[PDB]
A paper describes a structure:
An innovative protein crystallization screen formulation called FUSION has been developed to help with the production of useful crystals. The concept behind the formulation of FUSION was to combine the most efficient components from the three MORPHEUS screens into a single screen using a systematic approach. Most of these additives are small molecules and ions frequently found in crystal structures of the Protein Data Bank (PDB), where they bind proteins and complexes. The efficiency of FUSION is demonstrated by obtaining high yields of diffraction-quality crystals for seven different test proteins.
In the process, two crystal forms not currently in the PDB for the proteins α-amylase and avidin were discovered.
Author numbering:
A (entry chain B), C (entry chain B): 27 to 60, 66 to 147
B (entry chain A), D (entry chain A): 27 to 61, 67 to 147
C-alpha cells in the first residue's frame, strides 16, 4: 500500500508534506522550495476507485510568492525494493496580462518524489 | 474581475459547477462528463497574490468512474467583449500496474470554458 | 485523404507552407509568424503505416530569430464537412544557460490548422 | 561543445543513433526500442542561432511498427563532470479514427539521454 501521507523530497531538492488522506481521497499539505525557503499550501485528492495499492492522485500548489499556479498528477508506486516513490508530471501556469499571451503561459515537466 | 463560481461549459461539452472561493482561494465543485452522465468531485485553489482580476488557478478532478486522475490549470480571462473565459490545460493520469509502464501514463490537452 | 501539403493558417494567426510528402513520409516547409513577419524552416515526417486517410505526423521548427526549438505533433483530419483540419500540440523548448534551469525550459500548448 | 552525432541511450533503455549535423543544423538518425528490437527513422534540426555550445533541438520519430508519431525536443547540456546529456521532453501522438476522439490522443513524458 503506497500512501501519500508523510514528507517527500523530489529530484529538484524541493520538499513537501502531506497530511492524512480522508475517506473521500481529499488531502492537504505544504510545498517547500528554495538558500531562502518558501512555503505554499497544496490541496488535492487521491483516487480511491478499486482501492488500488498504487493509486493515482492530483494536487494543486497555490504559490504564495508569485501569481502562478502548479498542478501535479501522478501515481503512488512501490518499486522493486518495496519503496514508495511518486511519479508525477506538472503544468506550471504563469499569469499573463492579456488573453493573447495565453498560448505561452504553461510550462510542463516531471518530478519524482521519495520519502524524506 | 473574473470569478470561478458558477456553472461552466467547455469545448467538449463537459460541464462543471464551482462553489464559492473562500478568502484563501480554496474552492470545491463537481465535474460533469458523458459518453450517459457521470459526476465527479473537484478541488483546487485560485491564486490570490496581488488580487489580480484574471487570476491563475488549478484543480484536481477525483474521477469516480475510473482509477484515473486529471488536473487542470489556467487563468480566468476577460475577452474583448467583456465575457469570462477559462483557458486551461490538463494532465490526465491513467493508472498503470507496473512502475515500468509509467512513461506512457500521462495524457495532455486543453480545455476552454465559458459560463452556463 | 487528408494531405499535409499546402498552406495552413492556425488559431493564433501563424501560417505555414508544407511541400510534397515523399514515399518515406518526409517533408519540409516554412513556418511564418509575427506586424514584422519572420520565416523559419521546418522538417518532419508523416506516418504512412496502413496508409491511413487521417495520418499522424510530427515536425520540428528551427527558429531562425531565437535560440529556441518547437516540435509539433498531431493528426490530419477530415471533419464532418469534408474539410482538412490539423489538430496538433507542441512543446516549445527554450534555451537555458544552466542544466539546473532545465525543469522550467519547456512550454506546451495547442494549435489547430486549416487551409489558407 | 555538446554535439548530437553518435549513439545515445535513455532512461527507459531505448537507444538512438544520430548522423552528422550539417551547417543548417539538419540531421537524421534511427531510434531503437524494444518489448524484440524495432528500428524507426528520425529527422530533426539543431538550433544554430548564436552557435551556442548547449543548443536546443527537436526531432520526429516516424514509428514504423505503429500508426503513431512522437516528437522530442530539448537541449544538449554539459553536466558538472564534463559529460554530454540530452534533456528532452516528448509528445506521443496516437492515431484516432474520429476527430471527436482527438482530445485523448496525445501523451507527454520526459527522456534523458547519455552516450553509448
Ligand atoms: C528538505 O528537507 C530537508 C530536511 O527537512 C532540509 O534540509 C532541506 O532544506 C529541505 N529542502 C527545502 C527546499 O526546504
Ligand atoms: C451541460 O449542462 C446542460 C444543462 O446545464 C445539459 O443540457 C448538458 O447535458 C450538460 N452536459 C453534459 C455533458 O452533461
Ligand atoms: C497568413 O497568410 C496571409 C495570406 O498569405 C497573410 O495575409 C498573413 O500576413 C499571413 N500571416 C503571417 C503571420 O504571416
Ligand atoms: C542499446 O544498445 C546496446 C548496444 O548498442 C544493446 O545492447 C541494447 O539492446 C540496446 N537497447 C535496445 C532497447 O535495443
Amino acid at each position: 500500500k503506497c500512501s501519500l501521507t508523510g514528507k517527500w523530497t523530489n529530484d529538484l531538492g524541493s520538499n513537501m508534506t502531506i497530511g492524512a488522506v480522508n475517506s473521500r481521497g481529499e488531502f492537504t499539505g505544504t510545498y517547500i522550495t528554495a538558500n531562502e525557503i518558501k512555503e505554499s499550501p497544496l490541496h488535492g485528492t487521491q483516487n480511491t476507485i478499486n482501492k488500488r495499492t498504487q493509486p493515482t492522485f492530483g494536487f494543486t500548489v497555490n504559490w504564495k510568492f508569485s501569481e502562478s499556479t502548479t498542478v501535479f498528477t501522478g501515481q503512488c508506486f512501490i518499486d522493486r525494493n518495496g519503496k514508495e516513490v511518486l511519479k508525477t508530471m506538472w503544468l506550471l501556469r504563469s499569469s499573463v496580462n492579456d488573453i493573447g499571451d495565453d498560448w505561452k503561459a504553461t510550462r510542463v515537466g516531471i518530478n519524482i518524489f521519495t520519502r524524506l
